[PDB]
Paper text:
The human monoclonal antibody C10 exhibits extraordinary cross-reactivity, potently neutralizing Zika virus (ZIKV) and the four serotypes of dengue virus (DENV1–DENV4). Here we describe a comparative structure-function analysis of C10 bound to the envelope (E) protein dimers of the five viruses it neutralizes. The neutralizing antibodies induced during a DENV or ZIKV infection target the envelope (E) protein and, with a few exceptions, are serotype specific. The epitopes are distributed evenly at the surface of the icosahedral virion, which is composed of 90 E dimers organized in 30 “rafts” of three parallel E dimers (Kuhn et al., 2002).
Furthermore, the X-ray structure of ZIKV sE in complex with a bivalent immunoglobulin hinted at its mode of bivalent binding to virions. We obtained crystals of ZIKV sE in complex with C10 IgG and with F(ab’)2 that diffracted to 6-Å and 3-Å resolution, respectively, and determined the X-ray structure of the latter by molecular replacement. The lateral packing between sE dimers was identical to that observed in the ZIKV sE/Fab complex, but the Fab arms had a different elbow angle. Although the antibody hinge region had weak density, it was possible to trace the H217DKTHTH221 sequence of the upstream tether, which converged into a blob of density at the 2-fold axis that we assigned to the first inter-chain disulfide bond of the hinge core segment. Because the density was weak, we re-dissolved the crystals and monitored them by non-reducing SDS-PAGE, which confirmed that they indeed contained an intact F(ab’)2 molecule, ruling out any potential fortuitous cleavage in the linker region prior to crystal formation. The structure showed that the two arms of the C10 F(ab’)2 were bound to alternating sE dimers along raft-like rows. When extrapolated to the virion, this result indicated that the two arms of bivalent IgG1 C10 can crosslink the two 3f epitopes of each raft. The curved surface on the virion compared with the flat E rows in the crystal would bring the CH216 Cα atoms of the two Fab arms farther apart, indicating that the hinge requires farther stretching than in the crystals, potentially requiring further Fab flexing about the elbow angle to keep the C10V moiety unaltered on the epitope (compare the right panels of Figures 7A and 7B). Examination of the available Fab structures in the protein database indicated that the required adjustment is within the range of accessible elbow angles. We conclude that binding to the two 3f epitopes of each raft is the mode of binding and neutralization of IgG C10.
Author numbering:
A (entry chain H), E (entry chain H): 1 to 52, 52A, 53 to 82, 82A, 82B, 82C, 83 to 100, 100A, ...
B (entry chain L), F (entry chain L): 3 to 9, 11 to 27, 27A, 27B, 27C, 28 to 95, 95A, 96 to 106, ...
C (entry chain A), D (entry chain A): 1 to 154, 160 to 403
Write the structure that this text describes.
């Protein structure tokens, strides 16, 4: 049974360097070239490069030509990917994927069935921000939907309730987005009847515990 | 670098086709065309290699073809297990590898539903602080929409559609500005139809 | 099928019911062996490895000089002497210099001077010895078992690897359902390593003659000299020049890397994988016994469903044709009806098949296969299948 | 006195009452010029300097390769092309490789391949041009003014420095009490720089011929090419080899430093002081006018006190003798009585003096002086002083 | 007028590096080789090396071959001596001294009058100790002389009085010595009449102000 | 490396000779023999170069000679300005320079006086601490003595003679031990005579 097991997730700062590993088992490691392909969250796959496990020759993508180094340990049957001068754009899941070397030991043309087995992937998050509390701000209805914006927090996750848990129907908290700032932001919306605007009170209880902050913010319809 | 549709959907039992257009240097030049399926949270799985050949254990419901610079993956007899993202890939004349943009395949478990979009301006409490305009998309299906922000705009953050509690999909887009920036002065398109909402700081 | 697509491809036909076939495997070549009632097998010598090489000698081709020192004596005061004359890492020379009252001597005339400088090597090359007993040849076997190009594998019965050494020149490879093939080779044949060394310099490698290697005019240290080297014949890269009976200076000759590269123009090249040397030149004569070779699917019944070209039949550089088809039936495993004909009515066989016994093996539907045909000169029709659903492709050779 | 102790010492005798004397100054040589009623003067060409050299060309003799890249196309798909073919820093070559279904091509046959690699120079040499107008010769003059060896100085009248250039080949050096000496030289004489370049490599320097330099088979960049160089004829150090219609690889030839050093065996050597080039070879013909040269101490009265040898008189390589004495008197400045005689009774002069007008100059007591004598062949007595306290030393030549 | 002016005194720790300068004026700097000769306190002169100011060639003593670097700046007409991997034994006055180069610009044989002019010298003190107060201890007579030992202080100097300055005749304070320890020690003696042993009291007032310490120590004859 | 006497003295008007013995590689090999005078606090001054030659401005009272491997500096008509340290020096066959040990020249301004030496053991207060034996030399002239510490010893610190207030010279030598080291169990020589003093921890 062919398996590729990769190292744990990493969090690092811009300008740092990461080395992720990829240990191969179930097949003869020296007969295969190991490729590195990455994927930003919600984005496509992007081929980074490959290493011939048998003789150490590499091939990198011209866009990564300077910052990446691919290496190998034969005794451990492990390939290594090292990315330097990190930027916020390198936040992604990094997979390794094999392809067979020829019977002469050279990796010139791939097999038509290249990338037949893939590792499980490693999440690496590149950001400069330090643990910080979110800032919490309201929203307005003008059947009608109202909500809460939770902005610039670190690290994930954020938990939000409404009216201390009494209002649960129609609630949707959105997944966070990573802006250029390097800090996350999400929002939680509730859809409520139009008859009950001036009658029911809506309190948003956000608590970002990694940042050790608890904020309650009341939402008022008032007027444009 | 390779262009394939963002999303394709079909009813169970039907056939669908995913196109993958390249150039004479990758897809139109060589037979190194492969198709990969990725389920959420899992590594990609090789589905098609050498535009027609299938690895053992993949259902013959998946087939491949190629004409000129456009390769195609046809899936007949759709099953709910087939819902995943599909990526074509090609070896290039320069010895590199290129991937397509990815296609969300949805096997329809519910009628198509137009999104409800609501666009909300910045609240006054954020305005006493230095700095956002928030666009909320809800209750659309399949979950593949495009967002556009009185003239075209850029540089903006948009979320990828996520499952609601009622099994519809939802997404959000934020436009980050400064207060004066705001004082100078969203439409989502889904399954070929575009719905639009407007705001104005000087309108009330 | 590993010979399909190779330009340097040789075809060898054995006797029908024959026992052995003689073959000559060369690096960069590939042989397709066929025989009646026998499966067609591709054979190739892929690597020649020399292991366990012993270091014979190292030659310094780029040197540097440090720690210059001198000893001087006045006229009639005898010969100068420097302590560094007793250090084997220094090179020294004596000469005469003009001396007198102006430079601290009571007499006028020639005074003895010795100058020494510490020799160190910047860049050296290494010659290793080769023992004929240690080279090992690796041979790849690929049967024409109707497997389709792009045969990814999840012990593949279509492929075999065989290793032959001078002390074990005979082997037998098992090929599953095809039985087994025997190889009796002659590794003694070839170039004699009695006077051949393995030369390494700047990560490039050659095979050179022993006498030429022993006669190159460079500094050298012995193979067993480890750690800090002791350089013999340092004068090959160090020379002393005098100026105006005032001074002598010592210069080092430049890198001779270009000179040796030039002397190595008519020499055999090599590479290295780890501590093993890899050769990309040579040949190997073998006699393969095929008494145990068998056709796996000779007993199948014929396929009854329809075939479909998944690729356009393609001409190889030797005029042979490749055909890849898809089968939509479920009666696999079965024989693929495949033939060539000029007359679609008689279906009289013309030409011949290269892959004996083409077969679909999977019982699952929509399975692919590949076969190879040797058409006659001129026009012909590739016919695959039987009856109404048979498919045809008109092909013309030359 | 700067010629005492030099083995390559030439003696030139001018006419008594003559106006000019012709001399030939060579590097490493020294001339002692004498004339009746004139002081004896040592003259030497000490340095030849070439200034303001313009860079003509640079040749790469050690190169390296990086950033290998390839573009490939299938058979009938045309010729491959790489973007690096438009970068002058890359060297590229096209060839044909075996292609087929196994490596992603719909057809079998030769497919076009191009391979490129980035050229960079590791070690280069520089040829600079020489303009005949810019060389400058420096001449040292040292009068035989009875100053003693070890003449430390606290504008020394015994020494003069003269500089002559092609545009100013004539000079006059002032020598204080001896007057002044004129030099009219012929710098045009010598080796023609019309076809001579100044070659620098690895901090070693030569003078080479222009045509030989233009014809050396190495990569080269133009003299005015600054910063990142643009290398012409990179193929002189880069070559492409093919293997088995599978790959082509590019190799760089080794350093040619040894080869050029070998081609430079029959060539003139040089050195450099800063941005100035120094030559240790050549000659210079001069005519020195001495009408203004005078004897400083011809008017002194004779010393009356006693002299004392402070060193043992020593024979120079030409048979001349050096005598250093100490004077315990106070009547300085005065003429030193100094002569050679075979008969201590007659004191008839034999031989001759080399240093005209030996004199003690200090009025203080215990002051030293040095003179030089040209004895006759055979036995003689060096006699210094007058009367009872005169000192003698028996000296024999040959 | 020929002058050689050298840089100010230096104090450094063992294993550090010192660079002392020697600026020449009154003569053509490029015509002379500059030598470095040092002298430990109370010890002989030891030749360290020389630099040809005209072309940069050097010659070092084989005992200093690795640790010394001699260099020059022609525009400033200044020679530099750099000694690395300092030890306690390098504490010394370092002089520069010139000698003439030949008329060909080479410095092969010296002139017989070598070292005709010398710089004024630079004191360099190599020690590892930090500013510390002295320890003060008495002495015994058994015409009779008594004294005070002041041990292990840093930095110099130490001032000692006797009986607050009332006893000044016959007093001698000795110069300090630098032991292997890297700290100084001296002693102060007084010679006093034999009749007055048990009558006059002798107090030693040492005050090491750089170390900010004041010690008074009484000396008693008592008995062996 | 070059051996010359530590100190020489003479009365004003007399002549004195300083010897400088080398080897066949420095002094016996070449005429590069020089003599330097150093006054306290000042740089060395070149007195003699090229064993006999004098630089201008140096009194002809200084003269040099050489025989075999021994060079000599003779100073006649001694003056009180001549009191200084004198160093011979030589260029060597290896191209290096070597200096002598230095000679203290004293022009006698006072009769020769033997030193008073007093040797004192460690006091009890130092003994309550972990760790010295102190030797004091006073009232000797000229100031050049040698110190020796019931058998020969080494590794010890000695001072160079310094001027007293009465213009005699004084010096001190310390022997640094540990208490047990002390429990296991100085002589100064001046102008050819040696005076000795003893101590004993077990004697009282």
């Amino acid at each position: 049974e062919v398996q590729l097991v990769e190292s744990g997730a990493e969090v690092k700062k811009p300008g740092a360097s990461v080395k992720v590993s990829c240990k191969a088992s179930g097949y003869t490691f020296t007969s295969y070239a190991m490729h590195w392909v990455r994927q930003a969250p919600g984005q496509r796959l992007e081929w980074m490069g490959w290493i011939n496990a048998g003789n150490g020759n590499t091939k990198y993508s011209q866009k990564f030509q300077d910052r990446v180094t691919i290496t190998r340990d034969t005794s451990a049957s492990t390939a290594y990917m090292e990315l330097s001068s990190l930027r916020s754009e390198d936040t992604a899941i990094y997979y390794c994927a094999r392809d067979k070397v020829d019977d002469y030991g050279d990796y010139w043309f791939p097999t038509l069935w290249y990338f037949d087995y893939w590792g499980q992937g490693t999440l690496v998050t590149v950001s400069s921000a330090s643990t910080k509390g979110p800032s919490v701000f309201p929203l307005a209805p003008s059947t009608a939907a109202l909500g809460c914006l939770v902005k610039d927090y670190f690290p994930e996750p954020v938990t939000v309730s409404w009216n201390s848990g009494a209002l649960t129907s129609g609630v949707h908290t959105f997944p966070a987005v990573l802006q250029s700032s390097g800090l996350y932001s999400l929002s939680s919306v509730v859809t409520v009847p139009s008859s009950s605007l001036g009658t029911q009170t809506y309190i948003c209880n956000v608590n970002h515990k990694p940042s050790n902050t608890k904020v309650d913010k009341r939402v008022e319809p008032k007027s444009c | 670098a390779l262009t394939q549709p963002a999303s394709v959907s079909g009813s169970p039992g039907q056939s669908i086709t995913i196109s993958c257009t390249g150039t004479s240097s990758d897809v139109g030049g060589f037979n190194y065309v492969s198709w990969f399926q990725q389920h959420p949270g899992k590594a990609p799985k090789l589905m098609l290699y050498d535009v027609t050949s299938r690895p053992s254990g993949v259902s013959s419901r998946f087939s491949g073809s190629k004409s000129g610079n456009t390769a195609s993956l046809t899936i007949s007899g759709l099953q709910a297990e087939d819902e995943a993202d599909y990526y074509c890939s090609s070896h290039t004349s320069r010895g590199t590898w290129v991937f397509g943009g990815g296609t969300k395949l949805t096997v329809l478990g519910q009628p198509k539903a137009a999104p409800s979009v609501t666009l909300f301006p910045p609240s006054s409490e954020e305005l006493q602080a230095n700095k956002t305009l928030v666009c909320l998309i809800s209750d659309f299906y399949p979950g593949a929409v495009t967002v556009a922000w009185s003239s075209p705009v850029k540089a903006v953050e948009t979320t990828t559609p996520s499952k609601q509690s009622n099994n519809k999909y939802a997404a959000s887009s934020y436009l980050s500005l400064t207060p004066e920036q705001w004082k100078s002065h969203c439409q989502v398109t889904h399954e070929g139809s575009t719905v639009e909402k407007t705001v104005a700081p000087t309108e009330c | 099928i590993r010979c399909i697509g190779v330009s340097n491809r040789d075809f060898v036909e054995g006797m029908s019911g024959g026992t052995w076939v003689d073959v000559v495997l060369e690096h960069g070549g590939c042989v397709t062996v066929m025989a009646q009632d026998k499966p067609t097998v591709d054979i190739e010598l892929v690597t020649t490895t020399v292991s366990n090489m012993a270091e014979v000698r190292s030659y310094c081709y780029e040197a540097s000089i440090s720690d210059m020192a001198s000893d001087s004596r006045c006229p009639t005061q005898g010969e100068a002497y420097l302590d560094k004359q007793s250090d084997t890492q220094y090179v020294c020379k004596r000469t005469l210099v003009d001396r007198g009252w102006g430079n601290g001597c009571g007499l006028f005339g020639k005074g003895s001077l010795v100058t020494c400088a510490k020799f160190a090597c910047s860049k050296k090359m290494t010659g290793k010895s080769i023992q004929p007993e240690n080279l090992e040849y690796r041979i790849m076997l690929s049967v024409h078992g109707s497997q389709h190009s792009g045969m990814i594998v999840n012990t593949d019965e279509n492929r075999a690897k065989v290793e032959i050494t001078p002390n074990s020149p005979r082997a037998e490879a098992t090929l599953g359902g095809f039985g087994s093939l025997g190889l009796d080779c002659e590794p003694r044949t070839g170039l004699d390593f009695s006077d051949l060394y393995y030369l390494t310099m700047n990560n490039k490698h050659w095979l050179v003659h022993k006498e030429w290697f022993h006669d190159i005019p460079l500094p050298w240290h012995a193979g067993a000299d480890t750690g800090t080297p002791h350089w013999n014949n340092k004068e090959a890269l160090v020379e002393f020049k005098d100026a105006h009976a005032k001074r002598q200076t010592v210069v080092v000759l430049g890198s001779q890397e270009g000179a040796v590269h030039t002397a190595l123009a008519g020499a055999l090249e090599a590479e290295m994988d780890g501590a093993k040397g890899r050769l990309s030149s040579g040949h190997l004569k073998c006699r393969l016994k095929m008494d145990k070779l068998r056709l796996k699917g000779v007993s199948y019944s014929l396929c009854t469903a329809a075939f479909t070209f998944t690729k356009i039949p393609a001409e190889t550089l030797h005029g042979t044709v490749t055909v890849e088809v898809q089968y939509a039936g479920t009666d696999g495993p079965c024989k693929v009806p495949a033939q060539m004909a000029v007359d679609m009515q008689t279906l009289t066989p013309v030409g011949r098949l290269i892959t004996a016994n083409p077969v679909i093996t999977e019982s699952t539907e929509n399975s692919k296969m590949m076969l190879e045909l040797d058409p006659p000169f001129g026009d012909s029709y590739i016919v695959i299948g039987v009856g109404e659903k048979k498919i045809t492709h008109h092909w013309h050779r030359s």
